[PDB]
């Protein structure tokens, strides 16, 4: 509710915090499965696509020992029939990776597919209505705003640049993804403070998952747990312990 005087930075989680879980789980990711075949058929000749496929081919070789692993075989020739089979293998492999737990090869192709979806106006990133107005006010009040999500930074930029509220990239000072560390590790938050160029105690982290909130608290970061429609429930003790907010408007600077 009321932010300590020492906070100069607000760090924001995305899923379940600024954006509904339903958008991420039921729209953003399913889009990839629905579109990977068409995307590969359409853009196969693009240098970037050839590079993405090479990365997935290398990853497929590394995963060959796994039960259920889908190989991405060497081509038989270079005719449209050979291409059809190759594309089906890449498609099957992408779907298999997604069906299991998130390799760099998979994320790389996903980011390029989303670039087309968002840039062409096929999809918009959903934000809860209280987010943009509060953020604008926080910045007016001098707060810096950074994002921390397991979603790649490149994908995060697409979400803010094509939101249901228009292009809101200017509302963000910087982005962090798993390259700086995993969200349930306190060391990640110590590195985030270093990257931003502040102290851990200058940060207020808003997130919906308690395991992330507790990791951040262990790093001497201030935390508030955000409750949105569809979030995993909080235990009684958690509701008592953590400062809860159901809207960004509830934060007072």
Q: Which residues are annotated as a binding site for substrate?
A: 149-150, 183
Nearest distance, CB of residue 130 and Mg ion, angstroms: 16
3-state helix, strand, coil in the chain (%, to 5): 50, 10, 35
- When the beta carbons of 60 and 216 are compared against Mg ion, the nearer one is 216
CB atoms within 10 A of CB 161: 17
- From its phi and psi, is residue 206 left (phi > 0), alpha (psi between -120 and 50) or beta? beta
Nearest distance, CB of residue 24 and Mg ion, angstroms: 9
Of 7, 10, 12, 13, the one binding Mg ion (CB under 5 A) is: 13
- When the beta carbons of 13 and 52 are compared against Mg ion, the nearer one is 13
The answer to whether the CB of 230 falls within 8 A of the CB of 16 is: yes
Nearest distance, CB of residue 4 and Mg ion, angstroms: 8
Of 7, 16, 18, 224, the one binding Mg ion (CB under 5 A) is: 16
Instruction: Compute the distance between CA of residue 185 and CA of residue 239 in angstroms, rounded to an integer.
Output: 22
Nearest distance, CB of residue 93 and Mg ion, angstroms: 28
> x/- contact string, 190-229, with Mg ion (CB under 5 A)?
----x------x------x---------------------
- When the beta carbons of 7 and 36 are compared against Mg ion, the nearer one is 7
CA angle 67, 68, 73 (to 5 degrees): 110
How far from 56 is each of 42, 104, 113, 116, 170, CA to CA, in Å? Answer: 18, 9, 14, 19, 33
Query: Which position's Cβ is nearest Mg ion?
Result: 16
Of 7, 10, 12, 15, the one binding Mg ion (CB under 5 A) is: 15
With contacts defined by CB under 5 A, name the span among 31-39, 42-50, 92-100, 189-197 that binds Mg ion: 189-197
Name the β-bridge partners of 205.
Answer: 11, 223
Radius of gyration of the chain (CA): 20
For Mg ion, the binding residues (CB under 5 A) are 13, 15-16, 194, 201, 208
């Amino acid at each position: 509710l009321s932010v300590p005087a020492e906070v100069t930075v607000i760090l924001l989680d995305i899923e379940g915090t600024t954006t509904p879980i339903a958008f991420v789980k039921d729209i953003l990711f399913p889009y990839i499965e629905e579109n990977v075949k068409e995307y590969l058929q359409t853009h196969w000749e693009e240098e970037e696509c050839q590079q993405d496929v090479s990365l997935l081919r290398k990853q497929a070789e590394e995963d060959a020992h796994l039960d259920g692993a889908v190989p991405i075989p060497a081509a038989s020739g270079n005719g449209v029939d050979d291409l059809q089979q190759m594309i089906q293998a890449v498609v099957d492999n992408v779907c298999w990776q997604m069906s299991l737990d998130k390799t760099t090869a998979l994320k790389q192709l996903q980011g390029h597919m989303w670039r087309a979806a968002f840039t062409a106006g096929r999809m918009k990133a959903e934000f809860f209505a209280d987010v943009v107005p509060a953020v604008r006010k926080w910045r007016e009040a001098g707060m810096k705003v950074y994002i921390y999500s397991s979603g790649s930074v490149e994908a995060q930029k697409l979400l803010f640049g094509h939101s249901t509220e228009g292009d809101i990239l200017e509302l963000v000072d910087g982005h962090f993804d798993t390259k700086i560390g995993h969200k349930v590790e306190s060391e990640s938050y110590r590195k985030i403070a270093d990257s931003i160029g502040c102290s851990t105690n200058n940060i207020l982290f808003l997130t919906d998952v308690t395991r992330e909130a507790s990791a951040a608290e262990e790093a001497d970061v201030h935390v508030a747990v955000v409750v949105r429609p569809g979030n995993a429930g909080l235990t009684d003790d958690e509701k008592t312990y953590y400062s809860l907010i159901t809207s960004f408007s509830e934060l007072y600077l």
